């Protein structure tokens, strides 16, 4: 019944299950093969709007006919919420809403939200080698959900999250009225930058800040074997020191198991905004134990750092293992024996199919108030630990391993609330069935911003049309 409403309002943009190009659309950005066997990943329909009129028509029809909407930019949702539901749903995919307009003179760019971050980086790089928008590591990440949840990458300690560099946005309201930052008010504008944007509206474009980047950016990857080297108690120094090391430098740690003769390997990877000479000087000054040899570094343009962590046009292809992620915030460093007890669990799974990662939260992330955007994890956070398990299509063993490791780490991590990064979506922390129960997941994502979030939600979508597993609830039923 619903599809008649759409076509009557405003073609060949409606992809029903019968339509011969249906499945290829659906799989293309359902990017978590853990959810492939699910029986909730088949929507009634998929709209790929080209203009805001299509978005308004879709919202109008889906509200008036009991259909749920699954907003999609890139499909990188760790829990795959953007392409599945337990209710009759339809995907509004912003694939073909992706225009990018770069303003070198004003240091800003209007990027339509269905564009990937690799595209934004590429189109900034062909205009300047000294402007950039700092983002996540994965270059296939859609801009829409990325800026909706906020964004952490190798450059966040210098410039903050991606949501800390947003100037304006354009959005489709539950009423279907097109509104930018100026006409929407700054409570809702506050919401969309780092709150659950799918629970506030469908965001079609963002005017985003561009930031200076030196013409020399240096990356490095240092592989060191955790098994026995007492020399790598730099990790011990790293935990208690990396959040206050010079903010141009972000070192990310990855823990996995790899065969050498099965032992535990440590991948120390980093970006530094400056020349290799100065990077070597700084890190030898602070962490002379890592032994970062100059042959382990790479200077270049910023875009080459982007390439390193992913013919100088390689960022425009979105063609590239099932997995689950958990995240945790450390406000005091993990005691050593506890850390080794956590790491030995890596052998409980197949070689290199499980990761434990440290993401540092220093520099500019201290400077920014917990209320600046919905993301509250600013000051006192040493880093964001990521638990990771991988496999292909019993699955319960992988999930049991991840949940066990998390629960072992329980007494040593953030407590009230137990922090959780929104980009690392994790349905275990809580779901919606009212506000008391939903606060369980809300306060973990947003410490006290969750309450402002509910207030804005009740004003903005009182009927709770924009609802999903982790949508901000409304006070009015």
Ligand X SMILES: *Cc1cc2c(cc1C)nc1c(=O)[nH]c(=O)nc-1n2C[C@H](O)[C@H](O)[C@H](O)COP(=O)(O)OP(=O)(O)OC[C@H]1O[C@@H](n2cnc3c(N)ncnc32)[C@H](O)[C@@H]1O
- Residue 286 or residue 426: which is nearer to ligand NAG going by CB? 426
- Residue 227 or residue 366: which is nearer to a second copy going by CB? 366
Among 14, 22, 25, 27, the residue binding ligand NAG under the rule CB under 6 A is: 27
Q: Please tell me whether residue 43 binds ligand X under the rule CB under 6 A.
A: no
Using CA of residue 316, residue 317, residue 321, residue 324, what is the dihedral sign? positive
Per-residue x/- track, 102-121, ligand X (CB under 6 A)? -----------x--------
Angle (CA) 310-314-320 rounded to 5° is 55
Angle (CA) 212-217-222 rounded to 5° is 140
Rounded CA-CA distance 271/50 in Å is 37
- Residue 19: both structure tokens together: 């339509």
Per-residue x/- track, 64-103, ligand NAG (CB under 6 A)? --------------------xxx-----------------
Stretch that binds ligand NAG, among 19-27, 57-65, 256-264, 454-462 (CB under 6 A): 19-27
186 CB-near residues (< 8 Å, 6+ apart): none
CB atoms within 10 A of CB 239: 21
Q: Please tell me whether residue 453 binds ligand X under the rule CB under 6 A.
A: no
Counts for the chain of helices (H) and strands (E), in that order:
16, 18
CB atoms within 10 A of CB 370: 16
In whole angstroms, how close is the CB of 47 to ligand X at the nearest point? Answer: 13
Secondary structure (3-state) at 55: helix
Q: Please tell me whether residue 202 binds ligand X under the rule CB under 6 A.
A: yes
- Number of residues in contact with ligand NAG, rule: CB under 6 A? 10
The closest alpha carbon to 163, from 135, 122, 131, belongs to 135
Rounded CA-CA distance 122/100 in Å is 10
> Which one of a second copy, ligand X, ligand NAG, none is in contact with 416 (Cβ closer than 5 to 8 A by kind)?
a second copy
In whole angstroms, how close is the CB of 469 to ligand NAG at the nearest point? Answer: 6
Residue 211 exposed, middle or buried by CB count within 10 Å (0-12, 13-18, 19+): middle
Q: Please tell me whether residue 145 binds ligand X under the rule CB under 6 A.
A: yes
Among 12, 24, 396, 416, the residue binding ligand NAG under the rule CB under 6 A is: 24
- Residue 85 or residue 305: which is nearer to ligand NAG going by CB? 85
**Is the Cβ–Cβ distance between 201 and 171 less than 8 Å?**
yes
Q: Please tell me whether residue 427 binds ligand NAG under the rule CB under 6 A.
A: yes
CB atoms within 10 A of CB 367: 13
Per-residue x/- track, 342-381, a second copy (CB under 8 A)? ------------------------xxxxxx----x-xxx-
Residue with tokens 């955790």: 226
Rounded CA-CA distance 231/82 in Å is 44
- Residue 4: both structure tokens together: 């008649």
Q: Please tell me whether residue 475 binds a second copy under the rule CB under 8 A.
A: yes
In whole angstroms, how close is the CB of 156 to ligand X at the nearest point? Answer: 8
Residues 32-61 that bind ligand NAG (CB under 6 A): 36, 40
- Residue 67 or residue 146: which is nearer to ligand X going by CB? 146
**Is the Cβ–Cβ distance between 356 and 346 less than 8 Å?**
yes
Stretch that binds ligand X, among 45-53, 68-76, 220-228, 444-452 (CB under 6 A): 68-76
Rounded CA-CA distance 58/36 in Å is 26
In whole angstroms, how close is the CB of 34 to ligand NAG at the nearest point? Answer: 11
310 CB-near residues (< 8 Å, 6+ apart): 118, 137, 138, 139
Q: Please tell me whether residue 362 binds ligand X under the rule CB under 6 A.
A: no
In whole angstroms, how close is the CB of 381 to a second copy at the nearest point? Answer: 9
Q: Which residues bind a second copy (CB under 8 A)?
A: 186, 366-371, 376, 378-380, 416, 435, 447-449, 451-452, 454-455, 475
Q: Which residues bind ligand X (CB under 6 A)?
A: 31, 70-78, 81-82, 94, 113, 136-138, 141-142, 144-146, 148-149, 151-153, 197-198, 202-203, 423
Q: Which residues bind ligand NAG (CB under 6 A)?
A: 23-24, 27, 36, 40, 84-86, 427, 469
């Amino acid at each position: 019944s619903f599809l008649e409403c759409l076509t009557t309002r405003i073609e060949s943009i409606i992809y029903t299950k019968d339509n011969p190009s249906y499945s290829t659309i659906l799989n293309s950005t359902s990017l978590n093969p853990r959810f492939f066997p699910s029986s909730a990943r088949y929507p009634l329909l998929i709209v790929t709007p080209l203009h805001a009129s299509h978005v308004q028509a879709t919202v109008h029809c889906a509200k008036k006919h009991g259909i749920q909407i699954r907003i999609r930019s890139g499909g990188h949702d760790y829990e795959g919420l953007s392409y599945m539901s337990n209710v009759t749903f339809a995907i509004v995919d912003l694939r073909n809403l992706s225009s990018i307009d770069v303003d070198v003179k004003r240091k800003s760019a209007w990027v339509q939200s269905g564009a990937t971050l690799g595209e934004l980086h590429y189109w900034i790089a062909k205009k300047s080698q000294n402007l950039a928008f700092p983002g996540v590591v994965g270059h296939t990440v859609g801009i829409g959900g990325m800026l909706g949840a906020g964004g952490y990458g190798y450059s966040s300690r210098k410039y903050g999250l991606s949501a800390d560099n947003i100037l304006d946005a354009q959005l489709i309201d539950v009423r279907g009225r097109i509104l930018n930052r100026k006409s929407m008010g700054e409570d809702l504008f506050w919401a969309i930058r780092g709150g659950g944007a799918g629970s506030f509206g469908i965001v079609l474009a963002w005017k985003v800040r561009l930031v200076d980047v030196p013409s020399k950016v240096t990356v490095f990857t240092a592989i060191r074997d955790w098994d026995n080297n007492a020399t790598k108690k730099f990790i011990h120094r790293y935990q208690r020191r990396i959040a206050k090391v010079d903010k141009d430098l972000t070192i990310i740690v990855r823990f996995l198991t790899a065969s050498i003769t099965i032992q535990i390997s440590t991948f120390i990877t980093a970006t530094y905004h400056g020349s290799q000479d100065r990077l070597l000087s700084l890190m030898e000054k602070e962490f002379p134990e890592l032994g970062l040899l100059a042959k382990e570094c790479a200077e270049g343009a910023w875009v080459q750092s982007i390439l390193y962590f992913n013919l100088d046009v390689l960022l425009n292809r979105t063609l590239n293992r099932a997995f689950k992620i958990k995240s945790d915030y450390l406000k005091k460093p993990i005691p050593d024996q506890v850390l080794e007890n956590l790491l030995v669990k890596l052998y409980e799974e197949d070689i290199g199919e499980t990761f434990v990662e440290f993401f540092p939260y220093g520099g500019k992330l201290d400077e920014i108030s917990e209320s600046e955007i919905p993301c509250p994890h600013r000051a006192g956070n040493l880093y964001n630990l990521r638990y990771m398990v991988l496999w292909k299509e019993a699955v319960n063993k992988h999930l049991s391993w991840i949940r066990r490791a998390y629960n072992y780490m329980t007494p040593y991590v953030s407590k009230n609330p137990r922090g959780a990064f929104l980009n690392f979506r994790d349905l275990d922390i809580g779901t919606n069935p009212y506000i008391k129960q939903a606060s369980n997941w809300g306060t973990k994502y947003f410490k006290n911003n969750f309450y402002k979030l509910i207030y804005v939600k009740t004003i903005v979508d009182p009927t709770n049309f924009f609802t999903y597993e982790q949508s901000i609830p409304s006070l009015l039923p």
